[PDB]
From a paper:
To investigate how [name] interacts with longer peptides, we determined its structure in complex with the 14-mer peptide [name] (b35). b35 contains a proline at position two, which is thought to render it a poor substrate for [name]. Nevertheless, b35 is presented on the cell surface by HLA-B35 in a [name]-dependent manner, suggesting it is processed through the canonical antigen processing pathway. The NBDs in the b35-bound [name] structure are separated by a distance intermediate between the apo and 9-mer b27-bound states. Densities corresponding to the first four and last four residues of the peptide are clearly observed, but the central six residues are largely unresolved. At lower contour levels, the two densities become continuous and appear linear suggesting that it is one peptide. Although b35 engages residues in both binding pockets, there are important local differences to the way in which 9-mer peptides bind to [name]. Specifically, the proline at position two gives b35 a different backbone conformation that eliminates the hydrogen bonds with D242, E246, and R312 in the N-pocket. Conversely, the C-terminal end of b35 makes stronger contacts with [name] compared to the three 9-mer peptides. The carboxyl group is situated within 3 Å of R210, forming a salt bridge instead of long-range electrostatic interactions. Additionally, the last residue in b35 is a tyrosine instead of a leucine or valine and forms a hydrogen bond with [name] N262; a residue known to affect substrate selectivity.
Numbering used by the authors:
A (entry chain A): 173 to 274, 285 to 484, 492 to 741
B (entry chain B): 135 to 681
C (entry chain C): 1 to 4, 11 to 14
Write the structure that this text describes.
């Protein structure tokens, strides 16, 4: 039923020993009052008969063991708690990433639910054993007072909860109404120019006061219930302290128990009061943590080829594409495009008409919405994920680089990091080294996180440099022409065409770049989800195609 | 600092509670410090005799005094939590009022998120100083002084041992209170870095999934998390060790404590009843003496928060002195001479440069030219929101600053391209700002703005509610509402900005044909040439200069 | 681990 205990299987032996250390410490602490009754009785009924030395010695040793065995006790707990706590975080993070591209809050709650449960659970274990073992020795002193103590205990359990229900309702109501009152003020402040324009600066003050008077009358009921909540706890604690003493007095005067036995119960009962109160206080907190943490378990329990470079062959057969939002969000269909090594191509079409999905589909990041497709004559999932990812790479629709130096930011995912100078050399080839050399340490200077070190002018060249670092046999791009200066990007496409990679590799970029428009060896375009155009811009215009119609 | 004095002075209007509550505090402390004294007295009387006359009397008074303490504790606590409320319900009223007197440039720099945290959350800390923090300190301090009096009453030879040991605990407490906070921030910095790793991954995941690069992301997190685990383990290990030294130091008293007491017990000047009162005194003093030094940290936090609020309380606005003139009638003539302005947050870039132009009640003036939408400053300058850095603007040949603030905006109104609306009924938004308006007057204004033609579809007509910031209504409907908001005020100088967004020429001509535009000055600002069909004069704005 | 004030 409950799933919160599923992770305890990896360290069962550690916790079992921890329980043994807790019970050992719990018994040792009880010696402090138990002897206190015994020495007091010994001296009132007998002289300085040297019996106190042996009795007192046991008091020191037992409590020393409790403190020492406590420290060795919890120190094992948290050290082992952190080790499993660490594993839990990585797996939960390791699970969320394993999803589509269609969020950090999921790691935030487990970041605060774990510590809330892990600390409170230790407190409950300590005090429950201490509470249990306190009853074990307290029952060995007098069977009459113990029965008295157990009878009055539920009143402390019950009455504060009944009264506390009245408070916890009112405090929430005040707090939520206060948020509403403060929220109205922000609505005026956020639209301040309009307020000053219409001279309602006094009206907003009046409207704010009106919402505060409604809270003032509510507070006058909040304070009244505070006395009864305080009066309930204080009287209940009192009414047991007097009760045990009086029932003790009749018992001891009857001769059944000695005066000292009553003394131990006085100290024992006082310790019990805080033990039950502390144990009950943390119960709502641990209850909230375990109940809320069940939501995390939804996320937790949610090929032969190893290419170093792609073979260049690609094909399609009635392929279809759709948006991740819903199956009815199909944006492409009837795709039959094919590719071969050495082919240079360009793509264009309506925004959102499956162009982005096709690029993602070509990278095997998402399964086709229909039809069939293959790469190098083989299915896309027919290769190892890391190797298939290294088979072909593409520049994303939003060119950016990670928060790392240009000498190492391009080595992501690669099994062999290239040389830092070679990384700088790749930046020179892509032209990013022109701005990269202006860094505080050139290529060695770390770039800002999420590509914040430079604008789109250098970001587009950075994406090309990252692709140039891999230098795959199959390349692709989507909307890369709108990220930086057109002339630099057009020359970059021309540089790729003039490079010897024009025979050792192939590429197809979905962008309206003029250089790729005129230098394309082939092209294919879609309209309304189906293929409806292709070829070079000049060739299509000569053939009176869509390019010629665009001249209107 | 002296800042505590102003915070203290603020609570003086609530004396009929503080004085009474402080009386109950004394009656609660005295009622509590005496029950241990009678507790030992009962067990001492119980030994060596069977005297109900002494036993019953001892129990009765012990029951009475603790009962009085318990009743006073509820009353003492009850009064202060009410005083905390009335402090919180007074600062928020005053703080909000002070903010509304600030200049517009102040709100351009300050973000609403900062102010909301400053107002809604931080003002709670401004109510926990006197009602809560002053108490725990005073309640504990008077108890510790009183308890040692009863300590001295029992056996002077036996108190001195507590006085020697106790400073050792506060020395350990002082070290631990600072040491664990220092390490806690060391955890926090590592934790913040771990969150940053998550933030980077989630914002650019499409780059990551282009490769099997998810391995480097978990390696990023697993090693940052590894630092957290090591830093975590370092902290609670010290907490556990600090617990041990304090726990064994408890034996440093009680082991020694009984040795002197039992030796004294046989020798004299002590009885078992007298001892038990001391025994339950000792472990209570250590708890309160630790709390007393503990609460001082919260003293600085709440007072430290006071510099946040009172900074906005005392910020002197830079607006000119409020105007006083209010003529019976206005001809609505506006003239400009060499006016120039720059934003306070973006100075030394004059958006407008030495402008000069004049408007008349019987004509219509149109403003054209992109200017990077810098022509909007004329709309803001005319309503006396900002101030002309150079030159001055004269309305009816008078300095606009001399006109009373309430009266001025009852004659000159504007409608920006962004129809800002407030939560509440439509009937409330149309007549916004006015002290009172008849529903009959709104109907004519609603019809004049052609807004009544669609609002009647809504429930209850004009009294239909509107979502916050106009979330419930459409933009085309929102523009009409703002138009009615201006037409209902019977203005003499109208300012319409980018009316071509949803209002056609015929819709705009209706506004231009009203009593506020039929013989009153109206300024229209747009980018298209459609304004040339009816504007009397044309001003083109290029690079902050009119040609 | 024992307990480590909010009372007014």
């Amino acid at each position: 039923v409950r799933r919160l205990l599923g992770c305890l299987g990896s360290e069962t032996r550690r916790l079992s020993l921890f329980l043994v250390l807790v019970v050992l410490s719990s018994l040792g602490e009880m010696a402090i009052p138990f002897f206190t009754g015994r020495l007091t009785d010994w001296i009132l009924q007998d002289g300085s008969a040297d019996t106190f030395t042996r009795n007192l010695t046991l008091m020191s040793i037992l409590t020393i063991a409790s403190a020492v065995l406590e420290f060795v006790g919890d120190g094992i707990y948290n050290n082992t708690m952190g080790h499993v706590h660490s594993h839990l975080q990585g797996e939960v993070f390791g699970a969320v990433l394993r999803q589509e591209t269609e969020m950090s809050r999921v790691t935030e709650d487990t970041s605060t639910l774990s510590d809330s449960l892990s600390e409170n659970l230790s407190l409950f274990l300590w005090y429950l054993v201490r509470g249990l073992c306190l009853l074990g020795i307290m029952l060995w002193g007098s069977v009459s007072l113990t029965m008295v103590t157990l009878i009055t205990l539920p009143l402390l359990f019950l009455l504060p909860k009944k009264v506390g229900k009245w408070y916890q309702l009112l405090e929430v109501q005040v707090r939520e109404s206060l948020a509403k009152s403060s929220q109205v003020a922000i609505e005026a402040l956020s639209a301040m120019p309009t307020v000053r324009s219409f001279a309602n600066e006094e009206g907003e003050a009046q409207k704010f006061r009106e919402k505060l008077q409604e809270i003032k009358t509510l507070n006058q009921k909040e304070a009244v219930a505070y006395a009864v909540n305080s009066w309930t706890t204080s009287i209940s604690g009192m009414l047991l302290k007097v009760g045990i003493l009086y029932i003790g007095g009749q018992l001891v005067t009857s001769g059944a128990v000695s005066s000292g036995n009553l003394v131990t119960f006085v100290l024992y009962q006082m310790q019990f009061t805080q033990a039950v109160e502390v144990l009950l206080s943390i119960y709502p907190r641990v209850q909230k943590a375990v109940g809320s943490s069940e939501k995390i378990f939804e996320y937790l329990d949610r090929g032969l080829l190893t290419p170093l470079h792609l073979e260049g062959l690609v094909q399609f057969q009635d392929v279809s594409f759709a948006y991740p939002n819903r199956p009815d969000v199909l944006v492409l269909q009837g795709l039959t495009f094919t590719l071969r090594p050495g082919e240079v191509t360009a793509l264009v079409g309506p925004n959102g008409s499956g162009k982005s999905t096709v690029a993602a589909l070509l990278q095997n990041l998402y399964q086709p919405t229909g039809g069939q497709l293959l790469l190098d004559g083989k299915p896309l999932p027919q290769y190892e994920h890391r190797y298939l990812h290294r088979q072909v790479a593409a520049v994303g629709q939003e060119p950016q680089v990670f928060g790392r130096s240009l000498q190492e930011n391009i080595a992501y995912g690669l099994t062999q990091k290239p040389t830092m100078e070679e990384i700088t050399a790749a930046a020179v080839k892509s032209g990013a080294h022109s701005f990269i050399s202006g860094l505080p340490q050139g290529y060695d200077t770390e770039v800002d996180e999420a590509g914040s070190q430079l604008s789109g002018g250098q970001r587009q060249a950075v994406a090309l440099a990252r692709a140039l670092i891999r230098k795959p046999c199959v390349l692709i791009l989507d909307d890369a022409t709108s990220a930086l200066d057109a002339n630099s990007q057009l020359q970059v496409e021309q540089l790729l065409y003039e490079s010897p990679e024009r025979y050792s590799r192939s590429v197809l970029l979905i962008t309206q770049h003029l250089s790729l428009v005129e230098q394309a060896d082939h092209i294919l375009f879609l309209e309304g989800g189906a293929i409806r155009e292709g070829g070079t811009h000049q060739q299509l215009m000569e053939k009176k195609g869509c390019y010629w119609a665009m001249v209107q | 600092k002296v800042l505590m004095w102003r915070l203290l002075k603020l609570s003086r209007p609530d004396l009929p509670l503080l004085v009474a509550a402080f009386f109950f505090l004394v009656l609660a402390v005295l009622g509590e410090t005496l029950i241990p004294h009678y507790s030992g007295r009962v067990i001492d009387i119980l030994g060596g005799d069977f005297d109900p006359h002494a036993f019953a009397s001892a129990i009765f008074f012990m029951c009475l005094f603790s009962f009085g303490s318990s009743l006073s504790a509820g009353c003492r606590g009850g009064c202060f939590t009410y005083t905390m409320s009335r402090i919180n319900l007074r600062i928020r009223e005053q703080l909000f009022s002070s903010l509304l007197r600030q200049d517009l440039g102040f709100f351009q720099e300050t973000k609403t998120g900062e102010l909301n945290s400053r107002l809604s959350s931080d003002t709670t800390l401004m109510s926990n100083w006197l009602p809560l923090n002053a108490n725990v300190l005073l309640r504990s301090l008077v108890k510790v002084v009183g308890l040692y009096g009863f300590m001295l009453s029992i056996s002077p030879r036996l108190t001195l041992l507590s006085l020697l040991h106790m400073p050792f605990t506060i020395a350990a407490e002082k070290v631990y209170n600072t040491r664990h906070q220092e390490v806690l921030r060391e955890i926090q910095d590592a934790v913040a870095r771990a969150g940053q790793v998550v933030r980077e991954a989630v914002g650019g995941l499409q780059t990551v999934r282009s490769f099997g690069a998810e391995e480097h992301e978990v390696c990023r997190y697993k090693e940052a998390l590894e630092q957290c685990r090591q830093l975590y383990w370092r902290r609670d290990l010290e907490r556990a060790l600090y617990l041990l030294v304090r726990r064994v130091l408890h034996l440093g008293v009680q082991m020694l404590m009984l040795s002197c007491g039992l030796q004294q017990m046989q020798d004299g000047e002590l009885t078992q009843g007298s001892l038990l009162s001391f025994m339950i005194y000792q472990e209570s003093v250590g708890s309160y003496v630790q709390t007393l030094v503990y609460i001082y940290g919260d003293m600085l936090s709440n007072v430290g928060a006071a510099e946040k609020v009172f900074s906005y309380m005392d910020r002197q606005p830079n607006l000119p002195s409020p105007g006083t003139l209010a003529p019976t009638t206005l001809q609505g003539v506006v003239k400009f001479q060499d006016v120039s302005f720059a934003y306070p947050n973006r100075p030394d870039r004059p958006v407008l440069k030495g402008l000069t132009f004049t408007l008349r009640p019987g004509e219509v003036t149109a403003l054209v030219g992109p200017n990077g939408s810098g022509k909007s400053t004329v709309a803001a300058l005319l309503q006396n929101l900002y101030q002309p850095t150079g030159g001055q603007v004269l309305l009816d040949e008078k300095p606009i600053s001399q006109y009373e603030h309430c009266y001025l905006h009852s004659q000159v109104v504007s409608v920006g391209q962004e129809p800002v609306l407030f939560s509440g009924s439509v009937r409330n938004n149309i007549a916004y700002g006015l002290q009172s308006c008849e529903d009959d007057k709104v109907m004519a204004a609603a019809q004049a703005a052609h807004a009544d033609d669609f609002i009647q579809e809504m429930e209850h007509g004009i009294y239909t509610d509107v979502g916050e910031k106009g979330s419930q209504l459409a933009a085309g409907q929102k523009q009409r509402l703002a138009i009615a908001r201006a037409l209902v005020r019977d203005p003499r100088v109208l300012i319409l900005d980018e009316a071509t967004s949803a209002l056609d020429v015929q819709c705009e001509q209706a506004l231009q044909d009203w009593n506020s535009r039929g013989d009153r000055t109206v300024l229209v600002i747009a980018h298209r040439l459609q304004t040339v069909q009816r504007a009397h004069q044309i001003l083109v704005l290029q690079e902050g200069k009119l040609q | 681990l024992p307990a480590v004030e909010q009372e007014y």
